[PDB]
């Protein structure tokens, strides 16, 4: 299952 | 030992505001899912016959998570431009690796999350899944921004929960394909090399998984410092190839024996040139 990035760089 | 990885890449291109986003899923190094934004209809797709076990809702959500990823990578790439004070006339790349290893005890062994900018270390999540490692001064801005926001907590929850969960699932579902071996179909060939010197090629073909070991022997001694070894290459059908050659004195070839080691080979093979 894919992961989604919580906070931007 | 078992693993799941997601390799992600966004590439900003000259003139295009949108970056190309490519995401590949691996289960024990085997590609099982793929998403390419450059496809005419960008959606996650099966890349292994056991993924067919998933339904439209799995594929529908993954694809939506990917479009959300597309936007994350773009803004990040934009923010990264400013950090390194780069001109917006060229192309840049932002890559990501995330996943989890499982030990002999199918329990979790380690979480993985690391980022890169221009193919170089940027920021990574420490093994303790709590602290961050920056690579340069620009990275530290993301470090300080992330430490505050509790980013690590979110990545921890995925790398200790959902990563594990679905890997265990994929391992049950793709068991028949993932835990299979194809032992190598080794053979030795003979070619000229120099004046009064021939060359000996020890091939190993059609083998799975990728891991293998080829050795050459003179008088019961391994010829490590004298051995031309190519890196392992895919056949295009899911199996792998590798060969190893030595330069031998002509008329003294029978002295040389080739050995093959593979996890589908209970006894290691022993080969020699056959005139």
């Amino acid at each position: 299952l894919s992961l989604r990035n919580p906070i931007l760089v | 030992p078992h693993s799941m990885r997601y390799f992600e890449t966004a590439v900003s291109r000259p003139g295009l505001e949108e970056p190309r986003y490519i995401s590949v899923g691996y289960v024990d190094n085997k590609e099982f899912v793929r998403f390419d934004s450059d496809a005419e209809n960008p959606r996650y797709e099966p890349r292994a016959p056991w993924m067919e076990q998933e339904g439209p809702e799995y594929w529908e959500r993954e694809t939506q998570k990917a479009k959300g990823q597309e936007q994350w990578f773009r803004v990040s790439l934009r923010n990264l431009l400013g950090y390194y004070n780069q001109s917006a006339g060229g192309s840049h790349t932002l890559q990501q690796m995330s996943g989890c290893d499982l030990g002999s005890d199918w329990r979790l062994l380690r979480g993985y999350l690391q980022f890169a900018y221009e193919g170089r270390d940027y920021i990574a999540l420490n093994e303790d899944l709590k602290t961050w490692t920056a690579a340069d001064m620009a990275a530290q801005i993301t470090r300080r921004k992330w430490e505050q926001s509790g980013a690590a907590e979110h990545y921890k929850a995925y790398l200790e929960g959902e990563c594990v969960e679905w890997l265990h699932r994929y391992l049950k579902n793709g068991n028949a394909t993932l835990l299979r071996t194809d032992s190598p179909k080794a053979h030795v060939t003979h070619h000229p090399r120099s004046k009064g010197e021939v060359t000996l090629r020890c091939w190993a073909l059609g083998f799975y998984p990728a891991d293998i070991t080829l050795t050459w022997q003179l008088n019961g001694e391994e010829l490590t410092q004298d051995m031309e070894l190519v890196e392992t290459r895919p056949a295009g059908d899911g199996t792998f190839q590798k060969w190893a050659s030595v330069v031998v004195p002509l008329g003294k070839e029978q002295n040389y024996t080739c050995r093959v080691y593979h996890e589908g080979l209970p006894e290691p093979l022993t080969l020699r040139w056959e005139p």
């Binding site: - | 390799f7 890449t9 590439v11 490519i22 590949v24 590609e31 793929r34 390419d36 192309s91 790349t93 890559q95 690796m97 890169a116 221009e118 193919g119 170089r120 270390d121 060939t189 070619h191 090629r201 073909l205 190519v230 890196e231 290459r233 895919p234 056949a235 295009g236 059908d237 190839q241 060969w243």
Partner: protein, 99 residues
């Protein structure tokens, strides 16, 4: 920040003349990711070159597998030409049936 690609040109199966096989071109260890790859029969582009997978490895360097169908013969030559930022000139690697 550039990496030169490594190139391997090889068949899928043990080559025998007159018999169809698949010609591979494993391009590895490169950055940036944009690359142009062509596979040739006697200097002419082979049609329908299937591009297996853009991906990258543990060290962040990218890889890809180009492959097409070919019929090995005694006197036909096969090659993989690669153009990439890292190289000032297109590189051409010929197929050798002992490699």
């Amino acid at each position: 920040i550039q990496k030169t690609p490594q190139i391997q040109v090889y068949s899928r199966h043990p080559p025998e003349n007159g018999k169809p096989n698949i010609l591979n071109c494993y391009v590895t260890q490169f950055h940036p990711p944009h690359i142009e790859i062509q596979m040739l029969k006697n200097g002419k582009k082979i049609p329908k070159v299937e591009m297996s997978d853009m991906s990258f490895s543990k060290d962040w360097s990218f890889y890809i597998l180009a492959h097409t169908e070919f019929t090995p013969t005694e006197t036909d030559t096969y090659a993989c030409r690669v153009k990439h930022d890292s190289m000032a000139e297109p590189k051409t690697v010929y197929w050798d049936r002992d490699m």
